[PDB]
Amino acid sequence: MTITPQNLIALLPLLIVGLTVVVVMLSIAWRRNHFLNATLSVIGLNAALVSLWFVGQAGAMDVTPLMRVDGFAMLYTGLVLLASLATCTFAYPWLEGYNDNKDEFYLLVLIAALGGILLANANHLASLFLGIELISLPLFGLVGYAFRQKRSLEASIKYTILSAAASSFLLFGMALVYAQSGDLSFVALGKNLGDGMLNEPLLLAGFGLMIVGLGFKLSLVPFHLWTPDVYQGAPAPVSTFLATASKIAIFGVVMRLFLYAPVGDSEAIRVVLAIIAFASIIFGNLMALSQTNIKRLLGYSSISHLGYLLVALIALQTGEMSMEAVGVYLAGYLFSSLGAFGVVSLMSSPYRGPDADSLFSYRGLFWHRPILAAVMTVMMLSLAGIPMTLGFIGKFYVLAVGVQAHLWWLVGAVVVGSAIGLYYYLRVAVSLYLHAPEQPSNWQYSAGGIVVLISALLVLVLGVWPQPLISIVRLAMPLM
Amino acid sequence: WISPELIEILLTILKAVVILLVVVTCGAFMSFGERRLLGGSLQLVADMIKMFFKEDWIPKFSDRVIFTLAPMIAFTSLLLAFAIVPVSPGWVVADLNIGILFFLMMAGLAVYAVLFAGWSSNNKYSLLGAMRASAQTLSYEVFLGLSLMGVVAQAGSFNMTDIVNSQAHVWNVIPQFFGFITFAIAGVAVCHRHPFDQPEAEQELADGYHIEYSGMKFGLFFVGEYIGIVTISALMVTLFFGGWQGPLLPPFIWFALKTAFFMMMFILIRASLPRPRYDQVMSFGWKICLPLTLINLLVTAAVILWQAQ
Amino acid sequence: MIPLQHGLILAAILFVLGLTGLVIRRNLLFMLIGLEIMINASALAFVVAGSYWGQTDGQVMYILAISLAAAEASIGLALLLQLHRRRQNLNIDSVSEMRG
Amino acid sequence: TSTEVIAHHWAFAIFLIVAIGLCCLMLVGGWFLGGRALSAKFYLVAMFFVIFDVEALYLFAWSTSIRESGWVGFVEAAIFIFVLLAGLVYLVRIGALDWTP
Amino acid sequence: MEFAFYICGLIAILATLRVITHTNPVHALLYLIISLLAISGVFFSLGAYFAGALEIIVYAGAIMVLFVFVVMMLNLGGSEIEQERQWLKPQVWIGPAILSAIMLVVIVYAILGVNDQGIDGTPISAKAVGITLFGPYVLAVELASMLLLAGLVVAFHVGREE
Numbered sequence A: 001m002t003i004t005p006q007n008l009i010a011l012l013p014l015l016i017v018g019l020t021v022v023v024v025m026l027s028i029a030w031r032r033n034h035f036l037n038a039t040l041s042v043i044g045l046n047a048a049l050v051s052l053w054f055v056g057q058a059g060a061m062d063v064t065p066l067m068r069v070d071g072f073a074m075l076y077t078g079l080v081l082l083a084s085l086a087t088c089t090f091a092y093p094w095l096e097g098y099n100d101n102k103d104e105f106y107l108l109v110l111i112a113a114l115g116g117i118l119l120a121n122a123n124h125l126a127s128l129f130l131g132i133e134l135i136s137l138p139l140f141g142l143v144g145y146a147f148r149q150k151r152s153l154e155a156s157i158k159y160t161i162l163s164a165a166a167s168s169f170l171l172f173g174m175a176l177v178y179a180q181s182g183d184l185s186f187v188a189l190g191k192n193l194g195d196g197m198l199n200e201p202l203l204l205a206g207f208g209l210m211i212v213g214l215g216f217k218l219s220l221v222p223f224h225l226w227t228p229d230v231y232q233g234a235p236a237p238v239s240t241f242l243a244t245a246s247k248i249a250i251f252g253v254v255m256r257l258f259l260y261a262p263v264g265d266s267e268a269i270r271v272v273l274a275i276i277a278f279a280s281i282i283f284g285n286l287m288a289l290s291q292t293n294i295k296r297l298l299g300y301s302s303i304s305h306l307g308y309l310l311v312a313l314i315a316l317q318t319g320e321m322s323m324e325a326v327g328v329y330l331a332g333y334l335f336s337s338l339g340a341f342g343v344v345s346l347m348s349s350p351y352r353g354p355d356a357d358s359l360f361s362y363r364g365l366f367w368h369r370p371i372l373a374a375v376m377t378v379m380m381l382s383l384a385g386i387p388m389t390l391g392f393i394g395k396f397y398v399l400a401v402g403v404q405a406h407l408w409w410l411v412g413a414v415v416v417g418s419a420i421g422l423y424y425y426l427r428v429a430v431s432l433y434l435h436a437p438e439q440p441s442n443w444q445y446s447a448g449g450i451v452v453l454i455s456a457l458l459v460l461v462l463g464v465w466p467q468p469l470i471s472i473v474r475l476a477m478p479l480m
Numbered sequence B: 001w002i003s004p005e006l007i008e009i010l011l012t013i014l015k016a017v018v019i020l021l022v023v024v025t026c027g028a029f030m031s032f033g034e035r036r037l038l039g040g041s042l043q044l045v046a047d048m049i050k051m052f053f054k055e056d057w058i059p060k061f062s063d064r065v066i067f068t069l070a071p072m073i074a075f076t077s078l079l080l081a082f083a084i085v086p087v088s089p090g091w092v093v094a095d096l097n098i099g100i101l102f103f104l105m106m107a108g109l110a111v112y113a114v115l116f117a118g119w120s121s122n123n124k125y126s127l128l129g130a131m132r133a134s135a136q137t138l139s140y141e142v143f144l145g146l147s148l149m150g151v152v153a154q155a156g157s158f159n160m161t162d163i164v165n166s167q168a169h170v171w172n173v174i175p176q177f178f179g180f181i182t183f184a185i186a187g188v189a190v191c192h193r194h195p196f197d198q199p200e201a202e203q204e205l206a207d208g209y210h211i212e213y214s215g216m217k218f219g220l221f222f223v224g225e226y227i228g229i230v231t232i233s234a235l236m237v238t239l240f241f242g243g244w245q246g247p248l249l250p251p252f253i254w255f256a257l258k259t260a261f262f263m264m265m266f267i268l269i270r271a272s273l274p275r276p277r278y279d280q281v282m283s284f285g286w287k288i289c290l291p292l293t294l295i296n297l298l299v300t301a302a303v304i305l306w307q308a309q
Numbered sequence C: 001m002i003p004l005q006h007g008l009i010l011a012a013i014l015f016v017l018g019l020t021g022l023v024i025r026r027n028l029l030f031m032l033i034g035l036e037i038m039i040n041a042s043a044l045a046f047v048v049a050g051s052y053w054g055q056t057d058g059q060v061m062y063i064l065a066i067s068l069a070a071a072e073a074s075i076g077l078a079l080l081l082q083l084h085r086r087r088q089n090l091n092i093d094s095v096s097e098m099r100g
Numbered sequence D: 001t002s003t004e005v006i007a008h009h010w011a012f013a014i015f016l017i018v019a020i021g022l023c024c025l026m027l028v029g030g031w032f033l034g035g036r037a038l039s040a041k042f043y044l045v046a047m048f049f050v051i052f053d054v055e056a057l058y059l060f061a062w063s064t065s066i067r068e069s070g071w072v073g074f075v076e077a078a079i080f081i082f083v084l085l086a087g088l089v090y091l092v093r094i095g096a097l098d099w100t101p
Numbered sequence E: 001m002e003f004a005f006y007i008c009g010l011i012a013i014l015a016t017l018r019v020i021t022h023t024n025p026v027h028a029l030l031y032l033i034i035s036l037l038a039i040s041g042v043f044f045s046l047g048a049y050f051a052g053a054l055e056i057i058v059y060a061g062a063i064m065v066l067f068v069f070v071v072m073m074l075n076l077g078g079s080e081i082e083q084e085r086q087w088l089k090p091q092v093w094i095g096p097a098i099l100s101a102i103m104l105v106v107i108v109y110a111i112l113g114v115n116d117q118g119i120d121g122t123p124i125s126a127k128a129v130g131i132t133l134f135g136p137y138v139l140a141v142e143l144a145s146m147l148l149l150a151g152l153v154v155a156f157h158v159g160r161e162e
């Protein structure tokens, strides 16, 4: 369909991020300046947030056969933009330690944010596929940005090969779904069925291959083995972006796909997703038990937390507040992961070159970085689902949503995985305060410290008083 | 066994075979004309007999299939690209809906002759020279299609007969002049014609990829290059100079006159222009001709949309 | 007159062969080749499905698929060249340093 | 299924067959008769060719339907070509397309 | 258009089967080019004329050229993989072949049992694809330009020599 000016108003964050990509690229073409290009990128992302306010002042409508903009899309756009802004802020000191070109980083972060926004508004299989690829390829660049280092090149090769394979799986599944149902829009996948014929074998096989691709992207068992290697090998701001923005955007488009598709309330797909959620929770928590590397530990943590989110997704076509639970949990998980990966990024910045080691060495962090240790232990308590943290509010939402839908196996899985998480998260948070024998001064490092401190304060305050976040998420509802 | 359908299909097949044979013989005669201007038919027959009866020696440390396959590509790619060219009303081989896209298909396949000759000729210098030549041909194939896309935009279709019919009033050399010059440059550079002759001459660490090709494979490369310039000239005529359209002469006479004029102009610009440096050629391509094709497409679209009430 | 089942089965056969080539081959170049086979097979499946319905959306999905194929082939070959110039070895089992 | 289209299909098939067979017969006669007795800039330019060839395919699709898309399609293709040209300007200015540094 | 579809599908299957089990990279890329030309013929048999044209122009004319470029510049002359041929050993290929055969069996069983009126094979022109591309699929085109820009920037950053 044609694009009216109101439709152009509803595309405002997408347009502003694309224009920021063009402007930053032309500025690099003018002169290779780190500060100006980083500033232009963060100005473009903040302008995209203000454009989200302007989009909210407009209506909720279908801008294309491809895109649909509503409060759901606005919430996920805001989450992706916050994650991208935090990634740029954490990236500046680390890139200040870098030696090669250091503005293509911000260009790639902007293009990945553009893909996240497209997935936030995606109402079509074409827009879903394109948003996944626009997330993925800049992350191929960003994970191997320090390709002279062995670990970053290894993580880049693994992520590139496995994401190309997963995109092939997703595209073949989309092709089988389109072979069954003549339309590629979300609301028409399974529409031409009735009288108990919703489980068409070709439609289920197509959704299975799409589940393979998306479950690679979400680090769900058994498509999870890439996660600790890529999280450990990637640069720490890249690990921050990969943990927050990619997972949030892909899970949002999966939420909308299962909300809108008439095949979403299928018993077979629900049982398969229940198996995947159970295995993801238990396996991620069990594999994170004996990890001394903080980044591998957060990779397995991401596996288990996406399992909890999947549990909230399974109850979507039965209950009502599954969308609200996913929103609250995703806000809490975003802020906790931003704090944890930002502490990891700040202590690993500036970049020490490809030859020097990059181990975190979090033991006894309090005796020389007390504020970062306090932020890190708040984040470790939040990822554990401890009360007085927003992670507990998300976990409580997941438990309430599971109890309402009689998903008792998943409820018991959440309880057991939470106990295992208690063990390893408390191990990290108490190793922060022990005594270690042995083993800045610019405002961008201070900006990263302020970002992790504000994330910690948000986690604590919204864990004590979660009503504002619930009220914000509840008014961000999609088209029914 | 007499039916007008069988007569029609047999006559169309005969026309296609006649077109093919005339193109091959014209490529051989243009090879003779370049070798003389810088009997003759008897001399070309003698050359063909000599290349036939000389032993074909494939190198011992060379891959036989790739070495044999490179001259086949160099001949057949643009010789098959000729099949869309309408030489006269009712004298076209294939009236394809894709047309100029089929030409682009054949040129993209044609780069493999250079790549395969360089790899199979087991020599590092020949490999480096082939890498430079293939980089040059990619650098001009990048905008060959857009230089055609201006004319496609004016015609509204990819079919060549539709382009010829849309040039009924004014030939496309006048509105699509920048498309014309960019297509001329790209067609010369794809076929490795002067001034894009020897990109390996800028370094003593490189050699030509035609070295180690003896006898009939060298003859295939030679006649394939001249057939390539013949079909480039015919495409130039049908895309920018009305095809077969003229006031007084029969249509084939007009098409043959324009194609012969363009073949002679390719000979003249070989004899006249000097070859620039390799980096100059690559920079000129990527920095001048690709943006010119993009801007020409934009301006053509704006003019078309304005002139439609 | 050509069944949809036959075109989809052809695409499935090519996809499975590309996945097998991706798994069994230890050279990274052949892994990239298998990836290209898989993405081309999925694009062929989209073209078959679009031709069955008489819609242009199948060829549009093909165009997006080959845009992805071109860009990720570029990225994968750049990473292959980096691995070759840093290790002089394209064995994918040698680049296995990070482990659980 | 008309006579003209099947005639042109047969003519095109005979053209391809006789052409490839003529090349094959030329090589067969040549072989049978007669007695007996690197640098990363190439990757960069090839990758640039691939990327700009895909963007060229988008413009190929646009160019055949300019009148049917109207001025809105012109604006969209102008944004496409602007992004394409900004990428080209970036490649030229960073020295990616500079062959002699 | 039926015989062409079946013979081109057969050629594509045989060519990619030869691709995945070959040792010479240039031979494997040549067989891959043959499979791509066969798939383009399959596209032309179904009436997707633009898709077949782009299969030869882009897939068999740009991407495989990049692969041939990389193979020629890395100069694979049997660097400790050709002299081993570990993929031809039964213990390396037999397992994944069984797994892929099971996946193919499940997928093909899903394909069968689906209603099929048959593919008409009527030509869907490039004009209709262009109308759809710059009509209801505009943002796909713009963000695909952004996708190709991302690939360009990543490949330049990783693959430059210095």
Ligand SMILES: CCCCCCCCCCCCCCCCCC(=O)OC[C@H](COP(=O)(O)OCCN)OC(=O)CCCCCCCCCCCCCCCCC
Pocket: A049, A050, A052, A053, A056, A057, A058, A059, A060, A070, A071, A074, A075, A077, A078, A079, A082, A086, A331, A451, A454, A455, A468, A469, A472, A475, A476, A477
């Ligand atoms: C404090 C509690 C915790 C907060 C955490 C937030 C995390 C996510 C951030 C983005 C969330 C955006 C959610 C927006 C949902 C809006 C849903 C909706 O329908 O809004 C409509 C409303 C206008 O009302 P109405 O009359 O309905 O409009 C229709 C009239 N045609 O229009 C609106 O409501 C407009 C909404 C505009 C939002 C602008 C946001 C700007 C960015 C703020 C960042 C703050 C710093 C956070 C990070 C700290 C450091 C890490």
Ligand SMILES: CCCCCCCCCCCCCCCCCC(=O)OC[C@H](COP(=O)(O)OCCN)OC(=O)CCCCCCCCCCCCCCCCC
Pocket: A406, A408, A411, A412, A415, A416
């Ligand atoms: C490791 C620790 C975690 C263990 C796993 C999590 C708990 C598992 C609980 C299993 C419950 C099995 C229920 C089986 C029947 C389900 C279907 C049914 O008919 O349910 C009855 C009823 C809903 O039917 P309705 O007609 O609406 O009746 C309303 C009035 N009850 O249902 C209801 O009204 C609600 C039923 C609630 C069931 C109990 C939930 C609380 C569980 C308490 C703790 C776990 C059990 C005790 C400890 C075990 C060892 C750890």
Ligand SMILES: CCCCCCCCCCCCCCCCCC(=O)OC[C@H](COP(=O)(O)OCCN)OC(=O)CCCCCCCCCCCCCCCCC
Pocket: A289, A415, A416, A419, A420, A423
């Ligand atoms: C009476 C039956 C009915 C009532 C059931 C009530 C269930 C809930 C209350 C009971 C929970 C029992 C938990 C027992 C384990 C407590 C944790 C523990 O002992 O941790 C210490 C230990 C670390 O110490 P160490 O072994 O020295 O170090 C090894 C690593 N270097 O840590 C480790 O070695 C690893 C610890 C891993 C994480 C803890 C284990 C979690 C297991 C699942 C918890 C839920 C159990 C549900 C019920 C099961 C049956 C009773």
Ligand SMILES: CCCCCCCCCCCCCCCCCC(=O)OC[C@H](COP(=O)(O)OCCN)OC(=O)CCCCCCCCCCCCCCCCC
Pocket: B073, B076, B077, B095, B096, B097, B098, B102, B109, B112, D005, D009, D012, D013, D016, D017, D020, E033, E034, E037, E044, E049, E123
């Ligand atoms: C050593 C040998 C290697 C292999 C060489 C080639 C093998 C095949 C040779 C035999 C070909 C037999 C004839 C094929 C069919 C010809 C007619 C045809 O294609 O018709 C279909 C279609 C018609 O379209 P149209 O006329 O516009 O509309 C009619 C309405 N339905 O028209 C189209 O769809 C036209 C587009 C398809 C044209 C394909 C032409 C050949 C392409 C491959 C060239 C290979 C070059 C050499 C090797 C390169 C490196 C490997």
Ligand SMILES: CCCCCCCCCCCCCCCCCC(=O)OC[C@H](COP(=O)(O)OCCN)OC(=O)CCCCCCCCCCCCCCCCC
Pocket: D001, D002, D009, D013, E001, E002, E003, E004, E007, E008, E011, E034, E037, E038, E040, E041, E042, E044, E045, E046, E047, E121
């Ligand atoms: C023969 C046994 C095998 C010998 C070795 C291999 C040789 C090549 C075999 C495959 C290619 C030729 C297949 C036969 C095609 C004959 C022409 C034909 O079937 O035309 C029908 C149709 C015409 O179009 P349409 O208008 O729709 O027709 C209905 C009429 N109203 O046509 C169409 O719709 C499209 C026709 C096909 C597409 C064009 C040709 C594609 C060529 C692909 C070559 C692949 C590489 C081959 C390499 C060989 C060596 C290994």
Ligand SMILES: CCCCCCCCCCCCCCCCCCCC
Pocket: A366, A374, A377, A378, A381, A388, A433
């Ligand atoms: C309610 C918030 C809970 C999480 C934050 C915990 C950190 C609070 C601020 C830091 C205080 C650290 C005190 C460490 C004392 C160690 C003494 C060791 C020798 C006895």
Ligand SMILES: CCCCCCCCCCCCCCCCCCCC
Pocket: A282, A408, A409, A411, A412, A413, A416
């Ligand atoms: C290795 C970790 C394993 C954790 C397993 C956790 C299991 C928790 C208990 C689940 C009990 C579910 C009971 C469901 C009964 C449903 C009856 C329905 C009747 C209509």
Ligand SMILES: CCCCCCCCCCCCCCCCCCCC
Pocket: B018, B019, B022, B023, B026, B087, B088, B091, B230, B250, B251, B252, B253, B256, B259, B260
């Ligand atoms: C360099 C030119 C190559 C041309 C190749 C095709 C030649 C086709 C010859 C066709 C001749 C008859 C055309 C129809 C009749 C009109 C002309 C009558 C007087 C010759």
Ligand SMILES: CCCCCCCCCCCCCCCCCCCC
Pocket: A003, A014, A015, A018, D070, D071, D072, D075, D076, D079, E138, E139, E142, E143
């Ligand atoms: C029919 C005549 C119309 C004249 C006015 C045309 C201009 C108004 C409509 C413009 C629509 C342009 C849409 C462009 C979308 C670009 C999205 C880029 C995302 C990165």
